[PDB]
Amino acid sequence: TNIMLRKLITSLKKQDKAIWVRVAEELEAPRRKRAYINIYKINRYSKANDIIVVPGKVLGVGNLDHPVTVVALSFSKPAKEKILRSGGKVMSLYKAIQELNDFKGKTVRLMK
Amino acid sequence: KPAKKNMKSPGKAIKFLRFDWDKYYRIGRQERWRKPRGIDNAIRLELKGYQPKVKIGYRTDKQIRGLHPSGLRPILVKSVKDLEAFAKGKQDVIIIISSTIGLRKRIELIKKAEELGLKIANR
Amino acid sequence: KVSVLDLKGNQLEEIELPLFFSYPVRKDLIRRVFLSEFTKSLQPKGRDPLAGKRTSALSFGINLGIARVPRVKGSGEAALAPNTVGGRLAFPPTTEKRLVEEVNLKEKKLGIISALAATADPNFVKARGHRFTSNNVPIILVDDFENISKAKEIMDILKSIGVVDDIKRVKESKGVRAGKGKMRGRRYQIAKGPLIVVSNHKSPVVESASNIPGVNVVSANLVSVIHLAPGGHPGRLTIYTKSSINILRQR
Amino acid sequence: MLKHQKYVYVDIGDQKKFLKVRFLKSRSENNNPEAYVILDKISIKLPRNAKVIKYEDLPAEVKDKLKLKL
Amino acid sequence: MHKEKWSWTVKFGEGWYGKHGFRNPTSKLVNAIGLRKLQEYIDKVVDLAKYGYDKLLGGGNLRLPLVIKVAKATEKAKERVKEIGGEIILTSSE
Amino acid sequence: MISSKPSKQRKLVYNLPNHLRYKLLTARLSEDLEKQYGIKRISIRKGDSVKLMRGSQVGYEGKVVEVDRKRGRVAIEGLTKKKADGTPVYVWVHASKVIITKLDTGDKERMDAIERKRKMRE
RNA sequence: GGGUCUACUGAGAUCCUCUGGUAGGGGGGCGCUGUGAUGGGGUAGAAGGUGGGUCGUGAGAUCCACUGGACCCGUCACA
RNA sequence: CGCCGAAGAAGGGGGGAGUGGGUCACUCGGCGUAAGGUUGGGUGGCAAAAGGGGAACAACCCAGACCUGGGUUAAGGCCCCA
RNA sequence: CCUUUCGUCUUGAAACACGGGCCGGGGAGUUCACAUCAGUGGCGAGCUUAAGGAGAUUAUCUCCGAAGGCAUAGGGAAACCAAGUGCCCGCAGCCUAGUUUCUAGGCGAGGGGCAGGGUCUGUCAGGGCCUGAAGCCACUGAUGUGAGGCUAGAAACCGGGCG
RNA sequence: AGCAAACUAAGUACCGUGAGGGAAAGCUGAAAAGAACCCCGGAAGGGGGAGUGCAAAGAGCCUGAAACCGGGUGGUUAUAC
RNA sequence: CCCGAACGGAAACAUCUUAGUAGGGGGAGGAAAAGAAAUCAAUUGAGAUCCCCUGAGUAGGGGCGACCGAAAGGGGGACAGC
RNA sequence: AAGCCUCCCGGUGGAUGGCUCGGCUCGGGCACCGAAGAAGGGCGCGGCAAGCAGCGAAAUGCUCGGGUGAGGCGCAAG
């Protein structure tokens, strides 16, 4: 219902890389079942400097082993602080389009 | 342009008045249409020759759907300011000067159109 | 990045505003707030609970026939029925009905920023159609503004940075609004006008401008959507002062 | 609406067509042209409470713009 | 409703009729706390009395061996606390 | 603090108690009047004369001869509309569209009311 | 209904296909009265009524002559 | 074998219902001789199914009406009504 | 040229059933609260402030106020006990070379199946329940329940008065 | 509709032996300027003519729909729905 | 402050509930009532009463049927005690 | 000859539309009268006076101060 939220959907489907399009229907899914992630899970299924895309929101429960950079559309202000002190990086979907490493990175997995 | 009239004249529209408007005056002056939600009613049963129940299939063609009868596009005006936002130009639309605008405002208002080459019906 | 303006109309400083002003203009939440607080001021209306009920009316029973229908009549005349004359309403409104639309404090707060930021985009301010000759919007006045009492000098300031047009645009009070409200107090309708937010209240200018149509003075630590988005079309022209901004930046 | 006499209808040939314009009770003159603004509204029947004027009653200066429509 | 809605009894209404035992009115209140949650006070010697927790539940798994004195706990927690290096003080008071 | 509902307000002017009727009589003086009197507006009294600014008979000067205190309008001589019979009836013109031209200094009780309005000395 | 483009958030192009209808469910649209606004506007030449053109499948919209003699709509959102 | 299927999806969960008086035709029963009776099995309408024929017609046959127009056909019919 | 009269009740019954002189005006699924869902948004291991106070151009507004409630562990009556991991198939996406055009193979979130664990009970198998880390709040909406409860419709009974 | 109540009196007229029940009904324009005056009738804010006034829908007074009925316009009938 | 109802609900109804309300009688004032613990609760604590929000449909009652239904504590208001 | 239908015109009714010194809700103020005769009724009272309202045989208002300041003699023009 956010004008931005709809607007990006217009652009996410535009990009051809198979990962982005999958985001839309997870996004277009009902709000009440919208994607969401708690931290403790991602730390348990990741390697060093992994890039993972979160189709939803990230919740701050759990501890982090190794700095990893994540890409999502929504964060918990506490959760981010857990991320930075762990040495990772945050990255919005909207800002993530302009990266050719985002185009041609390696070791990316998608969770929820 | 030549394909403007060649469906309305043969596809003669139907007044679509209320079911059983003819018998009782308490309907005729209502002069509109309703969907009969009955059981023993007729047109809901689609019996022959009873000004058949309205349905979506009798549309007008989308190329002219809602075109002005002169072929242009009908868009209204209410004051002097609305004129400047005329779309594209005088070539595809016609203007209906307000049904309620005053003449002491009309006299200047009307002059603004023909100087811009617009077409005015309610002159 | 915005310029700074004086009591005369010459640019003399330049700062980038606190990161609030860049926020997305999230229309939807604004209305869901602009409505929410507006619910508060609905003094609960309600029809009288005992309207028309002051009767002993009754049906004449059945088999009378002369009593055509089980309509209820009082010893000769019919009343009390929902469908007929004068009796109590079908479902009369009462003050017991809910009025307010509650919003969480946080939910209200984060929304409020949007309108504040809405005052930044020159696109949105004209989207509400406010007319203004200032090249830069919004506009910041050096904080000596707070020291004017005489009302007339206010005008030249709105003349200085060139805002007189929206002053006149409000001056086109749309005669008389249609409907009964003309006899229920709301006899007119007026286009909203420029908004001034000042750092502290009780300054001389707080009350000094309540004559110019469309304008209001409201303290920064107080102002919300009910002043920035009159009508849920946020982008209404606004004015601020340097000292006020710092009072904002603290969130 | 005609009863205000803020309009005047024109008699031409007294035939079955009539012309109407807005008269100006001001301007104080019989030869004043500006008290008369020509329109283009030919009317089939003479209205009930209408006020009638004869074509020859018009100032000669204004006959020019009118006789052509006759 | 034995008569016609008695079907609701056998599927959705078990125990809808009659009583089932008594209750103890003096069952001591227990402030049970999860070890998993404990990696915070609340975001070195640590005791749950100041946080009012009585029995140290098994919870998840700790990260650092600390000083733990509480009222009570479970057995599995105790060895886990000893495993990491922490210890369990089963003091009956603060 | 007084209300602003239209209904109540109209009640006062349709129910004006007697000792407040000057309210719907006071009209604007002329500059020459205030020049030697130092006062803008004042209630009308008989024996005076006035000038008019609005209406089909704008620009008249007459004499204050008739008045309607309870509802608030006056009349002046030399200005009538003949009835069917031929007798004159007084044209009724409201103070709202008039300017006074002169007053009567023969009362000593209307005079002090003039004085108390902070007009300068005499 | 399902498989491409533009737009401070609805508008276009193309392809396939589907086309009786109560109980019932669901999608979308016009009208009435008030509130906020509203590039906005309209008014002694409104409103309304009568009759009649024109638009729209319709729901209705909208217009012209007259009558009237003082206040009334468009858009969005809300009740 | 054949058909539907990732354009349009086996299983699982969830919101909201109305529906518990049927009738008739054909066909195989029972009861009763019987019945446009009742009571069973299967199919079909109808109910909620227009359009053509049977003279008119809920159920008999043909045949499932997005609309306009053209053409060919079905059940039936082809002396006149027509 | 073709054409049983409206609505409803009704297997059909509508046409020998009912209610239907005409016109105009009025006139019937609303309110609250709870429960539960959907949609929508804010925040998130929290959520949430009520009641309430202070300041304010004064019922709008801003700040304050967790009071509390729900979730955050379940079992059993209790005494009490009290977990959150380990295997496998496998979607989207990714990587690999061929892209021969790709279930070719890995990685595999989610998910599914076997597990395991906590608990009471059974003397073991078992048996019941819980456990694979996300809810709360707000608006609108719908339905159930209780309140007159879509609208209208009874003989009834009772209290107190008046004949 | 709004409490029954906005009006010349509203719990008033009234229905009831009684406790009681319980009505209907707003708008002349700004100024009555209320049609002087002349003809008909006896009269009627009645007719006609004149006049006031922006306008008279001028007392029954804002605007003025239908059911209705009358005059007229346009078609149209006694071998037939 | 005394006296004291049926209607319905339980799909019947008699216990129960509807309910100390409808209503009767007495008596005041502008507010009334009440007001200084033979109070609580429970590790030796608080400190009149009243109302507001919670506690809480919890406790507890009843053909265990519809249903009824606290207190303590906490949070607010003014907090006066002779 | 009836008419029939439609329409123009007129009257018969007054919905629509408009206007409102009325009520309705809210909040906030204020919040006992009575044997010195209550509240509640019944009567009278003006030049020509019926109802209301006001008034009490001292009956459309009596006295005294205070304000007010040129008309007043209510609803309601003779």
Swiss-Prot record, chain B:
<comment type="similarity">
    <text>Belongs to the eukaryotic ribosomal protein eL32 family.</text>
</comment>
<dbReference type="Pfam" id="PF01655">
    <property type="entry name" value="Ribosomal_L32e"/>
</dbReference>
<dbReference type="GO" id="GO:0022625">
    <property type="term" value="C:cytosolic large ribosomal subunit"/>
</dbReference>
<dbReference type="InterPro" id="IPR023654">
    <property type="entry name" value="Ribosomal_eL32_arc"/>
</dbReference>
<protein>
    <recommendedName>
        <fullName>Large ribosomal subunit protein eL32</fullName>
    </recommendedName>
</protein>
<keyword id="KW-0689">Ribosomal protein</keyword>
<dbReference type="InterPro" id="IPR036351">
    <property type="entry name" value="Ribosomal_eL32_sf"/>
</dbReference>
<dbReference type="InterPro" id="IPR018263">
    <property type="entry name" value="Ribosomal_eL32_CS"/>
</dbReference>
<keyword id="KW-0687">Ribonucleoprotein</keyword>
<dbReference type="InterPro" id="IPR001515">
    <property type="entry name" value="Ribosomal_eL32"/>
</dbReference>
<dbReference type="GO" id="GO:0003735">
    <property type="term" value="F:structural constituent of ribosome"/>
</dbReference>
<dbReference type="GO" id="GO:0006412">
    <property type="term" value="P:translation"/>
</dbReference>
From Swiss-Prot, chain C:
<dbReference type="InterPro" id="IPR023574">
    <property type="entry name" value="Ribosomal_uL4_dom_sf"/>
</dbReference>
<keyword id="KW-0687">Ribonucleoprotein</keyword>
<keyword id="KW-0689">Ribosomal protein</keyword>
<dbReference type="GO" id="GO:0006412">
    <property type="term" value="P:translation"/>
</dbReference>
<comment type="function">
    <text>Forms part of the polypeptide exit tunnel.</text>
</comment>
<comment type="similarity">
    <text>Belongs to the universal ribosomal protein uL4 family.</text>
</comment>
<keyword id="KW-0699">rRNA-binding</keyword>
<dbReference type="InterPro" id="IPR045240">
    <property type="entry name" value="Ribosomal_uL4_euk/arch"/>
</dbReference>
<dbReference type="GO" id="GO:0019843">
    <property type="term" value="F:rRNA binding"/>
</dbReference>
<dbReference type="GO" id="GO:0003735">
    <property type="term" value="F:structural constituent of ribosome"/>
</dbReference>
<dbReference type="GO" id="GO:1990904">
    <property type="term" value="C:ribonucleoprotein complex"/>
</dbReference>
<keyword id="KW-0694">RNA-binding</keyword>
UniProtKB/Swiss-Prot annotation, chain E:
<dbReference type="GO" id="GO:0019843">
    <property type="term" value="F:rRNA binding"/>
</dbReference>
<comment type="subunit">
    <text>Part of the 50S ribosomal subunit.</text>
</comment>
<keyword id="KW-0694">RNA-binding</keyword>
<comment type="similarity">
    <text>Belongs to the universal ribosomal protein uL15 family.</text>
</comment>
<dbReference type="GO" id="GO:0006412">
    <property type="term" value="P:translation"/>
</dbReference>
<keyword id="KW-0687">Ribonucleoprotein</keyword>
<dbReference type="GO" id="GO:0022625">
    <property type="term" value="C:cytosolic large ribosomal subunit"/>
</dbReference>
<comment type="function">
    <text>Binds to the 23S rRNA.</text>
</comment>
<keyword id="KW-0689">Ribosomal protein</keyword>
<keyword id="KW-0699">rRNA-binding</keyword>
<protein>
    <recommendedName>
        <fullName>Large ribosomal subunit protein uL15</fullName>
    </recommendedName>
</protein>
<dbReference type="GO" id="GO:0003735">
    <property type="term" value="F:structural constituent of ribosome"/>
</dbReference>
From Swiss-Prot, chain F:
<protein>
    <recommendedName>
        <fullName>Large ribosomal subunit protein uL24</fullName>
    </recommendedName>
</protein>
<dbReference type="Pfam" id="PF16906">
    <property type="entry name" value="Ribosomal_L26"/>
</dbReference>
<comment type="function">
    <text>One of two assembly initiator proteins, it binds directly to the 5'-end of the 23S rRNA, where it nucleates assembly of the 50S subunit.</text>
</comment>
<keyword id="KW-0687">Ribonucleoprotein</keyword>
<dbReference type="InterPro" id="IPR041988">
    <property type="entry name" value="Ribosomal_uL24_KOW"/>
</dbReference>
<dbReference type="InterPro" id="IPR005756">
    <property type="entry name" value="Ribosomal_uL24_euk/arc"/>
</dbReference>
<keyword id="KW-0699">rRNA-binding</keyword>
<keyword id="KW-0694">RNA-binding</keyword>
<comment type="function">
    <text>Located at the polypeptide exit tunnel on the outside of the subunit.</text>
</comment>
<dbReference type="InterPro" id="IPR008991">
    <property type="entry name" value="Translation_prot_SH3-like_sf"/>
</dbReference>
<dbReference type="GO" id="GO:0006412">
    <property type="term" value="P:translation"/>
</dbReference>
<keyword id="KW-0689">Ribosomal protein</keyword>
